[PDB]
Design an enzyme around this catalytic site. Structure first.
Site, PDB file in Angstrom:
ATOM      1  CD  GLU D  61      -1.328  -0.301   3.670  1.00 46.75           C
ATOM      2  OE1 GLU D  61      -2.538  -0.317   3.369  1.00 46.75           O
ATOM      3  OE2 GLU D  61      -0.917  -0.423   4.838  1.00 46.75           O
ATOM      4  CB  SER D 130       2.268  -5.268  12.693  1.00 47.98           C
ATOM      5  OG  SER D 130       1.412  -5.387  11.570  1.00 47.98           O
ATOM      6  N   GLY D 134      -1.714  -8.476   6.297  1.00 45.74           N
ATOM      7  CA  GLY D 134      -1.286  -9.526   5.391  1.00 45.74           C
ATOM      8  C   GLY D 134       0.096  -9.279   4.834  1.00 45.74           C
ATOM      9  CB  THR D 135       1.935  -6.171   3.992  1.00 45.49           C
ATOM     10  OG1 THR D 135       3.292  -5.820   3.699  1.00 45.49           O
ATOM     11  CG2 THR D 135       1.389  -5.348   5.158  1.00 45.49           C
ATOM     12  CB  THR D 169      -6.657  -2.027  14.336  1.00 46.69           C
ATOM     13  OG1 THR D 169      -5.382  -2.677  14.324  1.00 46.69           O
ATOM     14  CG2 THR D 169      -6.647  -0.916  15.369  1.00 46.69           C
ATOM     15  CG  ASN D 196       0.055  -1.455  19.615  1.00 53.95           C
ATOM     16  OD1 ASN D 196       0.861  -0.529  19.699  1.00 53.95           O
ATOM     17  ND2 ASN D 196      -0.297  -1.990  18.458  1.00 53.95           N
ATOM     18  CG  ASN D 218       5.351   4.187  15.856  1.00 54.20           C
ATOM     19  OD1 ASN D 218       4.969   3.182  16.453  1.00 54.20           O
ATOM     20  ND2 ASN D 218       4.988   4.458  14.613  1.00 54.20           N
ATOM     21  CD  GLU D 244      30.053  -9.708  23.118  1.00 59.88           C
ATOM     22  OE1 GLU D 244      29.467  -8.622  23.287  1.00 59.88           O
ATOM     23  OE2 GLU D 244      31.282  -9.852  23.287  1.00 59.88           O
TER      24      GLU D 244
HETATM   25  N1  LIG Z   1       2.527   0.347  18.208  1.00 58.69           N
HETATM   26  C1  LIG Z   1       2.235   0.693  16.828  1.00 58.69           C
HETATM   27  N2  LIG Z   1       1.364  -0.195  16.019  1.00 58.69           N
HETATM   28  C2  LIG Z   1       1.053   0.143  14.604  1.00 58.69           C
HETATM   29  C3  LIG Z   1       1.574   1.280  14.028  1.00 58.69           C
HETATM   30  N3  LIG Z   1       1.134   1.339  12.773  1.00 58.69           N
HETATM   31  C4  LIG Z   1       0.348   0.251  12.550  1.00 58.69           C
HETATM   32  N4  LIG Z   1       0.313  -0.480  13.697  1.00 58.69           N
HETATM   33  C5  LIG Z   1      -0.439  -1.725  13.810  1.00 58.69           C
HETATM   34  O1  LIG Z   1      -0.421  -2.539  12.425  1.00 58.69           O
HETATM   35  C6  LIG Z   1      -1.358  -3.432  12.589  1.00 58.69           C
HETATM   36  C7  LIG Z   1      -2.029  -3.758  11.216  1.00 58.69           C
HETATM   37  O2  LIG Z   1      -1.151  -4.519  10.483  1.00 58.69           O
HETATM   38  P1  LIG Z   1      -0.621  -3.850   9.084  1.00 58.69           P
HETATM   39  O3  LIG Z   1       0.450  -4.711   8.459  1.00 58.69           O
HETATM   40  O4  LIG Z   1      -0.069  -2.464   9.399  1.00 58.69           O
HETATM   41  O5  LIG Z   1      -1.916  -3.720   8.048  1.00 58.69           O
HETATM   42  P2  LIG Z   1      -1.749  -3.490   6.417  1.00 58.69           P
HETATM   43  O6  LIG Z   1      -0.416  -2.844   6.138  1.00 58.69           O
HETATM   44  O7  LIG Z   1      -2.869  -2.582   5.935  1.00 58.69           O
HETATM   45  O8  LIG Z   1      -1.814  -4.945   5.626  1.00 58.69           O
HETATM   46  P3  LIG Z   1      -2.212  -5.072   4.020  1.00 58.69           P
HETATM   47  O9  LIG Z   1      -2.690  -3.731   3.506  1.00 58.69           O
HETATM   48  O10 LIG Z   1      -3.307  -6.108   3.855  1.00 58.69           O
HETATM   49  O11 LIG Z   1      -1.004  -5.482   3.213  1.00 58.69           O
HETATM   50  C8  LIG Z   1      -2.375  -2.786  13.521  1.00 58.69           C
HETATM   51  O12 LIG Z   1      -2.621  -3.610  14.579  1.00 58.69           O
HETATM   52  C9  LIG Z   1      -1.685  -1.494  14.016  1.00 58.69           C
HETATM   53  O13 LIG Z   1      -1.933  -1.317  15.471  1.00 58.69           O
HETATM   54  C10 LIG Z   1       2.479   2.218  14.860  1.00 58.69           C
HETATM   55  O14 LIG Z   1       2.926   3.207  14.370  1.00 58.69           O
HETATM   56  N5  LIG Z   1       2.786   1.895  16.238  1.00 58.69           N
HETATM   57 MG   LIG Z   2      -1.435  -2.463   4.398  1.00 59.95          MG
END
Ligand SMILES: Nc1nc2c(ncn2[C@@H]2O[C@H](COP(=O)(O)OP(=O)(O)OP(=O)(O)O)[C@@H](O)[C@H]2O)c(=O)[nH]1
Ligand SMILES: [Mg+2]
Ligand SMILES: Nc1nc2c(ncn2[C@@H]2O[C@H](COP(=O)(O)OP(=O)(O)OP(=O)(O)O)[C@@H](O)[C@H]2O)c(=O)[nH]1
Ligand SMILES: Nc1nc2c(ncn2[C@@H]2O[C@H](COP(=O)(O)OP(=O)(O)O)[C@@H](O)[C@H]2O)c(=O)[nH]1
Ligand SMILES: Nc1nc2c(ncn2[C@@H]2O[C@H](COP(=O)(O)OP(=O)(O)O)[C@@H](O)[C@H]2O)c(=O)[nH]1
Ligand SMILES: [Mg+2]
Lengths: 67, 420, 429, 429, 420
Positions: D61, D130, D134-135, D169, D196, D218, D244
């Site tokens: 994305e 994370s 899916g990514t 989320t 989180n 972050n 280490e």
């Molecule tokens: N602590 C923290 N969590 C984050 C942050 N940004 C995203 N997340 C978490 O990312 C998780 C979602 O997974 P993502 O991989 O980001 O979702 P995505 O990129 O839209 O996946 P696809 O579009 O299907 O490829 C959520 O639970 C968010 O809480 C951040 O800046 N800090």
């Molecule tokens: Mg995404």
């Protein structure tokens, strides 16, 4: 890395002695060191608070604008 | 923290609530705009303050009665639950058929007002007992919310039938029907009569044109003084529940009496000073209570004296001890030191002392006795019964209601005689 | 390498502690905002200029904690030590010891652990509370339990404001006060019985004031506790630690309920017209009229007396006056403890709080007496208790909160045993 | 002679990396302009003025990359080190691991190969993903396999964000997380599990920030990672190596799931009241509240704790504070590790970021613990999976991208293997 | 990148589309002349932004009605392919005769619009379920394009028959003939009903004189807010496919309810605050949704909430947790964390917050119950059938269609109860 380079703060010059008389224990100024360190940290905290107050006041300003 | 959702019902409740929010707005230094110049009000965009009060009825005239009056624009119109049909001064109408198939909206808005709080403490209702909409919807709401939120508490500032001269002809019926719904689903129920208020406004303030506004003002001042020791600092702060524990010995002896002090006319104020022995001398007087039941005909199971302003607590305690040891008869014995005290630290707007007296006495039973007469003398002839029957009311319920009332008064009759 | 933890719970405890910290921050030159223009016991260094007091304030009604947070000493404390609940205590027990107190007990224990690790030479605790209240007993009982099962060897110093005979500010106070004895014996080491009526009368007669107030109450209590801890904090010819009390005041660890006394408590003009030597002051100390508890020791005996003389006082005069006071006829000791008067001296006088009614005095004596007369107090209280529990009064407000009612009589059983135990040590052998 | 590569795939890891590179450029004096007005571990030189950071920013994305491709820092990175796709993975696995990944992971492999041949003494990888999206799950697995078969020998440390205990989320979290556990065990030698809700509670109670946001979390994670790589980057009186870390913390090839903690996370106000010594900081660094994974260390049993310090420290202070720590009774270790506390010192205090709620303070500690309590976390997540798989929920969305159905049960038993191990090692002899 | 084709149909579809392009224009700052003072529009040489759309209907009158209103100049003069004879609300007219002679050119121009893009993420349909033109040509075009592009997604913003009154007395027949082909080849059936929008614009806004312009504006706001977290930055972005997986657990149970927030009248706007609590309360409010089925009388298989505005996130998560742990009974429990959140960084023009709620619930099964009931009634009497067989269609189809409908609800209710 550069390990063993500071001994915060140390590394005196060439001067020294072969036996065991002075070891820079207590640094002969440890008390003034602690006092100045505490003063510096108090200054830091005062500045941080002085900034956070304004950063917060910005929010009330935005709220008045929105109202 | 420890919020309060105020409710009304019927024109009595609505008028008393109007004057009550007026007095509260006066205390916190607000103007009818709703701007300052958490327990009662709610913050609002642009620094506004909206009261947390749900107003309800089936007669939408009382709305235009309260809304048009001063200090009126506060209440948010998303709360004026006003059915556009009518109530007609009948219990079953306002509890089974007409005033009942509307309660769902009232529950929804009460839930919106409750789940939006942090730690809700108790509900504070004001309503009449013979009023169809008032008593009916009040007891239905009581049943619903007390079956719904048992964690919180309940407190109702009811008004009773003016004992000597009636105001409606079907007051006993609805009064006892409400009584049978209160003792089972409530936790605090203060009673007020429109009779002793007249004797007060006539022999304590030397008034000549007492409109219902001024009587409601007196009642509302008492209501504010009751809970004033919670929203303000105090050398010994109290709350709604400290009363609910230091007063009711048993889950049903929970019908209190209210007294306010001081109250003085022109010359009487010119002569008398403001010293807490005098406030005590005026507090316990039978002619100074909002319940047409001379406590001299009974005793006090307990009585909480909430002071306000600033005074040496030693004076308060000496007055309490002297009035308790000197009137050793008018108090009951098996509960030692049956009088409780409390001291907030804010006087009213324009004095230097204040006293609210909340007394669980065993003398108000007599009042219920008279109802136990009237209802009984209106049931063997089945008088006026067909109106209530016309809404599906099963007379059996009526019966047990009276029976319930019996136990209630019988309860008190068992205790003012108890010795130890 | 000396320090004490000052836990303040309930309502009366926290106001007494407020006045106590007033007195302390005053006498050590500390400014109320925390800075400073002999203190390692109470106040500690905070790594930035000022100093913070070793204390934690538990309470459920946010009003008093808010008043402290917006009063004069707002910058003094640590914004974590002020643990504020969400509702009130409602003057019952299970709502501070069984259902709700479990929300705050763990956070309190973590804070106390932090305070303990931030200290090295621990010597004891100082809990202040009433028991006629709802949280001062319940949450206090739970905290005493958790500490006694968590720390162990460190001895606790309870300062409990009991109900006085006649003056009453609650109707259910006997119930929850009895509900605290089941845990005062086990977990607590020293318990300084403090009433109110006696101190009201004290303020009436000596200080000449006729409109006394809880603030003066707390001022006097703060004075007594400061005179108690002067030995830890300051100089003295004959110092007395806080591990001396256990060896000097506790015959058997099941009878440790002491009562206080202080002198000289004099107004301004009533010191001008006097002498106020050491002899007269140690006569006035024992007078039950100005004892800080409701009891007439003429109807009891004395097990032990720890006297602490602060101010310019020579020891030989103390010894002579002690001989005289012990030789009097109307003040009789027990046979099984002939040498009873323990005495300590500190070379610092009182430090009057500004705006107080007391007068500056070059000398002062604070007595803490382990006596046998205090027992009757307990007996009296049981009387009240019975006249309620004979008719199941207010039991519903406790059974509604999981409190198994069978504890009640148990307490009135257990406390009853206490009386017998006193009747076991009043035995002239 | 030594450096680290850091990959930020997904939308979570990429925001974490945005904040992380922000903090890094801030501490090394590198202005956001690349041209600045000990860092070879992170930034290399493009022959002229601007220092290019070592990283690849992958995301299908292209929204967040366009936030950085034109935001405040676009001057910094290499326009080839920002790889974006034209769709999403829609939170399912196979679409980021079978169909769409097939095109992009090859380009990622080529770019990582180039970055590898550019650097000389590469010591470790740091993936940032994370598992919720899916990514970060599918792309994460595929890239991890590709690297573990391409490079191999080099260690790996994934700062992976799991789904919290209760908040989420996305509603299909238990699926596209279990399928990445197989990848995480074999190819990802270690795993620094992050959550989180833990950092949420930390912000809600420590830093007084009532309405936190992803940027605060972050910034804090960036501070943690800077503290981790301190010894490599900066000076040190007593250093530790990224090799280490592994042998001091990997007792067995299948128990290496480590959690983390950092201190002092304290706002400006509360810092005005703190001892600030090494004792209290390494004491608070052990409380459960500030463990960055919502687990209960009071229940499990630690195995090995590494502690990277920074700021002026006397090693004897660390030794005495660790003595006090091991003296605390409530914390307990396994039998096969009597020496579990590895230390490491550095002489660069924390760095302040304008807008960071962290108060500037000399001393700072960062702990990373391989413990056995973390197993419960896995078990917890297992529960969710159960109440889905019984109804084949959302399964056709997976089978519609070439993923065989039975993979779910296989990964389920694969994670049950971990729930067996991490509660098999913590057993007595 | 990730574009959207705008297929229209039926007069309702055309009106709603005109209003939707109006809203997108005065949000993206496109004045009705077509300038700026890729997700939706298309650059056009000369500095214009022609909206990528297509308008189909068997009457060329809707052409002039939609070109008459402002923002009509945006639509290019070429997309207006319209039939001549008119279907007169006959499913076979708009699905067999007129369909198979103009839908050819419809597909031709749709493909022309399709290949012109780089990544046509998903489709977008605005039509009705009642009219012959709308329902018929819409389901036929959807079948055709889903045979054309099996990789893309589908979505139809369909208006359904209101329960109280009906617009065209043969609504059940066209409704079931559209649902018998829509349920197989469509992923996001956003259902709307005119009665819900009526009640919204009256109760929750006090607007006494609602017009179809305002109702279409409300559904425009809903449709925009659906995807607005895609064409804008955001701390957590989603799209038209993350919804699909977070929303449909099965190939059939994919019919979504829609809601928008915040909405308040002139009066109640001065008082009420505006924070995540209030937005949540309006979000899950029963009447605030745009469906003639109170969701409280069922459960949710799942639900997503796309917020808008630069706000916190802990409030979001803790209020999701609260609304899921308090209203757990009205949610379904065999799924964990059955709600999904998403956040953007731009609220709509004129506020600082917004919420678009989408719900895959089991409360519309009641709507399908009533539709199947109407069908069975009007079918056992063969009512209005010679129109549906005089145009090359046998009754057999009709029968089986209802059968399919049965199976649909036969699933929903089922998963309402099953647990593990
Ligand atoms: N602590 C923290 N969590 C984050 C942050 N940004 C995203 N997340 C978490 O990312 C998780 C979602 O997974 P993502 O991989 O980001 O979702 P995505 O990129 O839209 O996946 P696809 O579009 O299907 O490829 C959520 O639970 C968010 O809480 C951040 O800046 N800090
Ligand atoms: Mg995404
Ligand atoms: N000596 C002294 N006693 C006090 C003071 N304030 C209150 N008290 C006593 O507190 C007792 C009342 O009980 P509380 O402590 O207020 O009740 P609680 O346990 O705190 O529960 P809540 O107050 O309802 O939250 C009275 O007997 C007072 O004598 C004070 O400032 N000094
Ligand atoms: N002090 C006072 N009493 C009132 C007021 N309004 C009504 N009451 C009482 O209301 C009683 C009649 O019942 P009511 O509730 O008014 O009937 P309803 O409102 O039509 O259901 C009467 O006994 C009145 O005394 C008021 O404004 N002030
Ligand atoms: N909310 C809304 N519904 C509309 C509007 N116009 C038509 N509808 C509905 O459209 C339905 C008829 O379907 P339609 O295909 O447009 O009729 P046809 O053109 O004769 O085929 C009717 O139920 C109308 O209520 C509108 O402008 N707003
Ligand atoms: Mg309390």
């Amino acid at each position: 890395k550069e390990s063993y380079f500071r001994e915060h703060p140390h590394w005196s010059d060439i001067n020294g002695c072969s036996g065991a008389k002075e070891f820079e224990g207590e640094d002969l100024a440890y008390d003034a060191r602690i006092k100045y360190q505490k003063e510096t940290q108090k200054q830091w905290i005062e500045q941080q608070i002085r900034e956070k107050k304004m950063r917060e006041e910005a929010e009330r300003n935005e709220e008045r604008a929105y109202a | 923290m420890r919020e309060i959702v105020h409710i009304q019902g019927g024109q009595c409740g609505n008028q008393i609530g109007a004057k009550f929010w007026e007095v509260i707005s006066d205390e916190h230094g607000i103007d009818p705009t709703g701007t300052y110049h958490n327990v009662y009000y709610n913050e609002a965009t642009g620094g506004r303050y909206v009261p947390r009060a749900i107003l309800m009825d089936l007669e939408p005239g009382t709305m235009d009665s309260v809304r048009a009056g001063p200090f009126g624009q506060l209440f948010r119109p998303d709360n004026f639950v006003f059915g556009q049909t009518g109530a007609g001064n009948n219990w079953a109408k306002g509890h089974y058929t007409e005033g009942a198939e509307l309660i769902d909206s009232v529950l929804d808005v009460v839930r919106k007002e409750a789940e939006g709080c942090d730690c809700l403490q108790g509900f504070q209702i004001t309503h009449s007992l013979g009023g169809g909409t008032g008593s009916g919807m009040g007891t239905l709401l009581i049943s619903k919310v007390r079956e719904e939120y048992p964690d919180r508490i309940m407190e109702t500032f009811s008004v009773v039938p003016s004992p000597k001269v009636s105001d409606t002809v079907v007051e006993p019926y609805n009064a006892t029907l409400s009584v049978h719904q209160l003792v089972e689903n409530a936790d605090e129920c203060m009673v007020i009569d429109n009779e002793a208020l007249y004797d007060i406004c006539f022999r304590t303030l030397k008034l000549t044109t007492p409109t219902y506004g001024d009587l409601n003002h007196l009642v509302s001042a008492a209501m504010s003084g009751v809970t004033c020791c919670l929203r303000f600092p105090g050398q010994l702060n109290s709350d709604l529940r400290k009363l609910a524990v230091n007063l009711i010995p048993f889950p049903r002896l929970h019908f209190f009496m209210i007294g306010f002090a001081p109250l003085t006319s022109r010359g009487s104020q010119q002569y008398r000073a403001l010293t807490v022995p005098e406030l005590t001398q005026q507090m316990f007087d039978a002619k100074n209570m909002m319940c047409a039941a001379d406590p001299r005909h009974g005793r006090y199971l307990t009585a909480s004296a909430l002071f306000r302003g600033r005074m040496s607590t030693k004076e308060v305690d000496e007055q309490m001890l002297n009035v308790q040891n000197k009137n050793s008869s008018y108090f009951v014995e098996w509960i030692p030191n049956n009088i409780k005290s409390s001291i907030c630290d804010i006087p009213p707007k324009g004095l230097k002392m204040a006293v609210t007296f909340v007394g669980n006495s065993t003398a108000i039973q007599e009042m219920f006795k008279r109802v136990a007469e009237q209802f009984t003398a209106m049931f063997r002839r089945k008088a006026f019964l067909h109106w209530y029957t016309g809404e599906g009311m099963d007379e059996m319920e009526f019966t047990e209601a009276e029976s319930n009332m019996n136990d209630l008064v019988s309860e008190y009759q068992q205790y003012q005689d108890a010795t130890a | 390498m000396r320090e004490v933890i000052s836990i303040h719970v309930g309502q009366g405890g926290i106001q007494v502690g407020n006045a106590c910290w007033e007195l302390f921050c005053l006498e050590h030159g500390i400014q109320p905002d925390g800075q400073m223009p002999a203190f390692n016991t109470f106040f500690s260094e905070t790594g930035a200029g000022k100093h913070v007091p070793r204390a934690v304030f538990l309470d459920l009604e946010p009003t008093v904690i808010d008043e402290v947070r917006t009063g004069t000493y707002r910058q003094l404390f640590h914004p974590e030590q002020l643990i504020s609940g969400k509702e009130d205590a409602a003057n019952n027990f299970a709502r501070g010891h069984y259902t709700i107190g479990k929300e705050i007990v763990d956070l309190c224990l973590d804070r106390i652990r932090k305070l303990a690790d931030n200290c090295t030479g621990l010597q004891g605790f100082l809990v202040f509370n009433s028991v006629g209240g709802g949280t001062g007993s319940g949450l206090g009982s739970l905290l005493l339990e958790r500490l006694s099962v968590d720390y162990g060897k460190k001895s606790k110093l309870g300062f409990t404001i009991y109900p006085s005979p006649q003056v009453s500010t609650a109707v259910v106070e006997p119930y929850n006060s009895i509900l605290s004895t089941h845990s005062l014996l086990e977990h607590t080491d020293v318990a300084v019985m403090l009433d109110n009526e006696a101190i009201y009368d004290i303020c009436r007669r000596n200080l000449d004031i006729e409109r006394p107030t809880y603030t003066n109450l707390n001022r006097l209590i703060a004075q007594v506790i400061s005179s108690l801890t002067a030995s830890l904090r300051f100089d003295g010819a004959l110092n007395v630690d806080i591990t001396e009390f256990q060896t000097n005041l506790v015959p058997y660890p099941r009878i440790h309920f002491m009562l206080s006394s202080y002198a000289p408590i004099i107004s301004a003009e009533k010191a001008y017209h006097e002498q106020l030597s050491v002899a007269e002051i140690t006569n006035s100390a024992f007078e039950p009229a100005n004892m800080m508890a409701k009891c007439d020791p003429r109807h009891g005996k004395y097990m032990a007396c720890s006297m602490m003389y602060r101010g310019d006082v020579v020891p030989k005069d103390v010894n002579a006056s002690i001989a005289t006071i012990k030789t009097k006829r109307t003040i009789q000791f027990v046979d099984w403890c002939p040498t009873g008067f323990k005495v300590g001296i500190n070379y610092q006088p009182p430090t009057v709080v500004p705006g107080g009614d007391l007068a500056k005095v070059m000398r002062a004596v604070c007595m803490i007496s382990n006596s046998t007369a205090i027992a009757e107090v307990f007996s009296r209280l049981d009387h009240k208790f019975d006249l309620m529990y004979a008719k199941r009064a207010f039991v519903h407000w406790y059974v509604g909160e999981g409190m198994e009612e069978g504890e009640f009589s148990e307490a009135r059983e257990d406390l009853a045993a206490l009386e017998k135990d006193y009747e076991e040590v009043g035995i002239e052998t």
